[PDB]
């Protein structure tokens, strides 16, 4: 491996490269300044990011001796053996030449010395502390660590002289660079565009890209060997990569019908900050984040959220309202914090909170254990949405069918500033057209007549009618005919009543008057 085999982690890679190589390339500089260089690095990030690859690349680029120590491997049940293993490893590393020690997964062998109960763990922790710092501890040898959760480590280990430097190894350009470097040794094709790959694989850590490329290359030969100069004109195409991706929703601005102004507003407010950061920096202002949808159920709020999430390269984390509450003390707030930490850990990201009426509930006062739980959940949500944060890129999108039961602290501007109302036959025509995109249609059917007889149906009702028509067509087979629609139209539901429509109209009128 080499420095050219690393992409995306440009700044941290450069920092580690200089801090490791400057002592090695020439120690005269540090002799002149009269200060010893740092001799420890704690890498942290999700698994499969390239941290051990970076350590190996640095060790290869320099005259070092990469020695790998695994966490679970060195720990044993025998008394006074794991400590002997660590001592032997350090003696070996220091014996031959100035080297790099990469001890992987230290969190398994650093349980904070308070939450642990096994004496071997504390003993190996103390051995590590003595080896890293003490009388003639280290003589021209550096240690590198790796973990997923850096919090579960001894404070004594995160000190200067042991792990004085902490590096965060967590984007589009880095992903494209990894795609380029992972396909350098194979002639794939002439019409394969990497922009779609860098935009579609928006949730890949970086070690999954190698697996994706290998899988596509293997499947290309798997599909090109059933029947079989053969070596000529070999390589992967777009189809193989698409199949590899198939082996996180499938919508693009088409499955939604009507609501043109709402579509345009969402598209602008979501795409402007992502496409033009330079313009906002020039204007020196942040973008709006929050949007709330309210109206009758089954209107397409989830569909709209998916459709505005898909065009950008952002992730999508959808969570139901009551899908987080727990009977325990502090579990719901822990779940909320984990959700938001994940959301802001992969920027950009759009979070779709469904059924806010279940979470917010207009806390007020209830005088009960459920009341206290709701109060704590609401306060945690308020702090996470707008509190002591950085708000790099997070787009919280709300969706409820009873906005009257929401406290006026989440509807506040800066959290859910946009109060969008989601409410016709012309719209129903577009809905039917978008639903019947890939279907064998009859020239004799008139969708206008079908839409004319709705008079207050929802998109769920239209999908139900389409499903009944498809069931009738499959029953006949075992194109869609008009009599299936004729017989399916009589069995309408119209699940949405009239009083709730009056309530929504009153709420919209009050909001407009406000």
């Amino acid at each position: 491996v080499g420095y050219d085999d690393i992409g995306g982690c440009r700044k941290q890679m450069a920092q580690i490269r200089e801090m490791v190589e400057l002592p090695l390339r020439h120690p005269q500089l540090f002799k002149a300044i009269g200060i010893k260089p740092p001799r420890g690095v704690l890498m942290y990030g999700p698994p499969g990011t390239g941290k051990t690859l970076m350590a190996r690349a640095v060790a290869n680029e320099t005259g070092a001796f990469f020695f790998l120590i695994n966490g679970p491997e060195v720990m044993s049940k025998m008394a006074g053996e794991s400590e002997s293993n660590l001592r032997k490893a350090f003696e070996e590393a220091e014996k031959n030449a100035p080297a790099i020690i990469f001890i992987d997964e230290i969190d398994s062998i650093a349980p904070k010395r308070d939450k642990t109960n096994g004496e071997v763990e504390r003993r190996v922790v103390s051995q590590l502390l003595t080896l890293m710092d003490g009388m003639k501890a280290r003589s021209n040898v550096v240690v590198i660590a790796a973990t997923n959760r850096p919090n579960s480590i001894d404070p004594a280990l995160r000190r200067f002289g042991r792990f004085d430097r902490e590096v965060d190894i967590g984007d589009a350009t880095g992903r494209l660079e990894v795609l380029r470097i992972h396909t350098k040794n194979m002639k794939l094709a002439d019409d394969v565009d990497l922009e779609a790959l860098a935009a579609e694989t928006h949730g890949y850590v970086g070690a999954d890209i190698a697996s994706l490329c290998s899988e596509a290359a293997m499947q290309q030969i798997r599909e090109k060997m059933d029947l079989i100069e053969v070596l000529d004109s070999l390589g992967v195409t777009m189809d193989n990569f698409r199949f590899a991706l198939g082996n996180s929703v499938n919508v693009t601005w088409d499955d939604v019908g009507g609501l043109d102004e709402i579509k345009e507003e969402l598209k602008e407010t979501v795409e402007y900050p992502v496409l033009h950061p330079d313009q906002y920096t020039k204007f020196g202002l942040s973008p709006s984040k929050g949007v709330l949808f309210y109206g009758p159920p089954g209107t397409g709020k989830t569909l709209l959220a998916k459709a505005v999430a898909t065009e950008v390269s952002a992730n999508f984390i959808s969570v139901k309202g009551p899908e987080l509450l727990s009977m325990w003390y502090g579990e719901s707030e822990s779940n909320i914090r984990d959700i938001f930490d994940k959301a802001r850990a992969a920027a950009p990201t759009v979070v779709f909170l469904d059924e806010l009426d279940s979470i917010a509930k207009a806390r007020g006062g209830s005088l009960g254990d459920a009341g206290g739980a709701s109060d704590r959940v609401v306060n945690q949500l308020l702090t996470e949405m707008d509190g002591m944060n950085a708000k790099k890129n997070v787009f919280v999108i709300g969706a409820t069918n009873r906005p009257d039961q929401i406290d006026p602290a989440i509807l506040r501007p800066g959290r859910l500033d946009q109060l969008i109302y989601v409410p016709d036959e012309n719209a129903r025509l577009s809905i039917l057209n978008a639903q019947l995109r890939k279907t064998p249609l009859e020239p004799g059917l008139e969708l206008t007549a079908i839409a004319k007889a709705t008079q207050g149906f929802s998109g769920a009702d239209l999908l139900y009618i389409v499903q009944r028509a498809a069931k009738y067509a499959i029953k006949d087979s075992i194109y869609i005919t008009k009599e299936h629609f004729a017989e399916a139209m009589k069995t309408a539901k119209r699940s949405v009543s009239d009083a709730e429509l009056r309530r929504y109209e009153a709420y919209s009128q009050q909001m407009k008057a406000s």
Binding site: K77, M78, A79, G80, E81, N117, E119, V120, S326, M327, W328, Y329, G330, D369, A370, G372, A373
Partner: peptide, 23 residues
Amino acid sequence: AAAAAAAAAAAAAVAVAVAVAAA
């Protein structure tokens, strides 16, 4: 002639924890 040696290192125990329910 050969010789034997004794060795007794450790074992593994199980703990019990208490939880709090918020109804």
